[PDB]
Amino acid sequence: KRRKTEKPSLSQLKSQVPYPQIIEWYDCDARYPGLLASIKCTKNVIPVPSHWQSKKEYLSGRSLLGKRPFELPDIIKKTNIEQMRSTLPALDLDYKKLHDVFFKIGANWKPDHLLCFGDVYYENRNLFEETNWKRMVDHKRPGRISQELRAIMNLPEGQLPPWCMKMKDIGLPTGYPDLKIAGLNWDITNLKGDVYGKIIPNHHRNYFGALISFETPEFE
């Protein structure tokens, strides 16, 4: 009773904290709030996954209904057993082939997503969309437009995007000062296919561990 009503306000607790935004309303009933704020707000600690205080047993997810059953890592998919055995609604293969897939072909191979120091998987999360996202931030760059989005845009080949004219009056993108586009800052004769422009960088090892040779263990 008295101890329950003795609690300091969470904002009174914020001042003790160097990173006050992590502390939350429920920290008021922390039996040792001044300590718990220091631990929770300590540098490298990773806050408890928030699926607690929910009674849903951490997975009720509607998204769980729409998750793909599985996908082979493409290196293993090269092994062709996908066609040999149909998992969807004998199969002998070469020892050298399989062994080389894991070792010769797949030594340097690593899953593309993984996760980071403090990455924690909440129920509603799905990594796959973020994998295509990270891969997409990689492939796609300004000045280039795929033929699909080009067809939807109804832009014929050899013709500049509609924002090149408004970009002539307004100016180059503030975010891309080094961006070049045919007809304006960049040679129109170099206009080719899906690329109407490219960023021209103005910036222009061994890491003590350079192996200088790569030799995998041989099965034979």
Counting contacts by CB under 8 A, is residue 132 touching another protein?
Answer: yes
Q: Which letter, b or e, does each residue of 36-63 get, where b requires 16 or more Cβ atoms within 10 Å of its Cβ? A: ebeebbeeeeeeeeeeeeeeeeeeeeee
Q: Which of 77, 82, 124, 130 binds another protein (CB under 8 A)?
A: 130
Counting contacts by CB under 8 A, is residue 154 touching another protein?
Answer: yes
Residue 167: its H or E element: helix 163-170
Token pair of 204, please?
């222009």
Write the CB contacts of 93 (distance below 8 Å, at least 6 apart in sequence): 79, 80, 81, 84
Cβ atoms of residues 62 and 124 within 8 Å: no
Cβ atoms of residues 161 and 196 within 8 Å: yes
Q: How many residues bind another protein (CB under 8 A)?
A: 108
CB of 61 to another protein, least distance (A): 7
Q: Which of 82, 141, 190, 192 binds another protein (CB under 8 A)?
A: 141
Q: Which of 83, 86, 87, 174 binds another protein (CB under 8 A)?
A: 174
Counting contacts by CB under 8 A, is residue 35 touching another protein?
Answer: yes
Q: Which stretch binds another protein (CB under 8 A): 48-56, 82-90, 92-100, 185-193?
A: 48-56
Write the CB contacts of 146 (distance below 8 Å, at least 6 apart in sequence): 140, 194
- The SS3 call for residue 180 is strand
CB of 46 to another protein, least distance (A): 5
Of residues 63-102, those binding another protein (CB under 8 A) = 64, 67-71, 73, 75-76, 102
Residue identified by tokens 């707000």 is 41
Nearer to another protein (CB atom), residue 49 or residue 193 = 49
Q: Which stretch binds another protein (CB under 8 A): 84-92, 183-191, 209-217?
A: 209-217
